[PDB]
């Protein structure tokens, strides 16, 4: 199903495959095994891996 999170802190992309996002962005997982998740930003429309410890669940 849909699994969504909100960013607690800004994250700047530093690799070829991760995703930059800002505090407050809504992100969905494209599941939550592990610490790095493939995500899509509902805010920005971009995608990439995000660190799970920068985000928190959001209905």
Swiss-Prot record:
Top-level taxon of origin: Eukaryota
Name used for this protein in its record: Proto-oncogene tyrosine-protein kinase Src
Full-length numbering of the shown residues: 82 to 141 of 533
Post-translational modification: The phosphorylated form is termed pp60c-src. S-nitrosylation is important for activation of its kinase activity.
Quaternary structure and interacting proteins, as annotated: Forms a complex with polyoma virus middle T antigen. Interacts with AFAP-110. Interacts with GJA1 and PXN.
Compartments it resides in: Cell membrane; Mitochondrion inner membrane; Endosome membrane; Nucleus
Function description: Non-receptor protein tyrosine kinase which is activated following engagement of many different classes of cellular receptors including immune response receptors, integrins and other adhesion receptors, receptor protein tyrosine kinases, G protein-coupled receptors as well as cytokine receptors. Participates in signaling pathways that control a diverse spectrum of biological activities including gene transcription, immune response, cell adhesion, cell cycle progression, apoptosis, migration, and transformation.
SH3 domain sequence ranges: 1-59
Assigned protein family: Belongs to the protein kinase superfamily. Tyr protein kinase family. SRC subfamily.
Tissue: Expressed to high levels, and with a high degree of kinase activity, in certain fully differentiated cells such as neurons, platelets and macrophages. Isoform 1 is widely expressed. Isoform 2 is expressed only in the muscle.
Cysteine-cysteine disulfides: none
